[PDB]
């Protein structure tokens, strides 16, 4: 009975950090959108130069 139940918390501690993965996944698209925004901010200035 003890060894049928020690499995529980030990397995539960296996992984609880998917929150970090999801947060940084959102950050990934955040940076992607920043990429395009700043690309446009560069290109508009490129054109005005000429």
């Amino acid at each position: 009975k003890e060894l049928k139940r020690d499995i529980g918390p030990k397995e539960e501690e296996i992984a609880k950090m998917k929150e970090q993965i999801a947060n940084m996944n959102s950050e990934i698209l955040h940076f992607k959108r920043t990429n395009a925004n700043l690309k446009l901010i560069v290109t508009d200035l490129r054109l005005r130069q000429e």
Partner: protein, 48 residues
Amino acid sequence: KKKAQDLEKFKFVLDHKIKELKRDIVPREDEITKMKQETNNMDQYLKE
């Protein structure tokens, strides 16, 4: 004698699951794993 016979197996066997449950746990706790590698590598992607 018969009671001690009906109790010797009770003294011995359940050690079988005593070992079995721990052995099953062996590969169970293991999966502090590739999800973390993913979180590390996608973090690298974030960096760039």
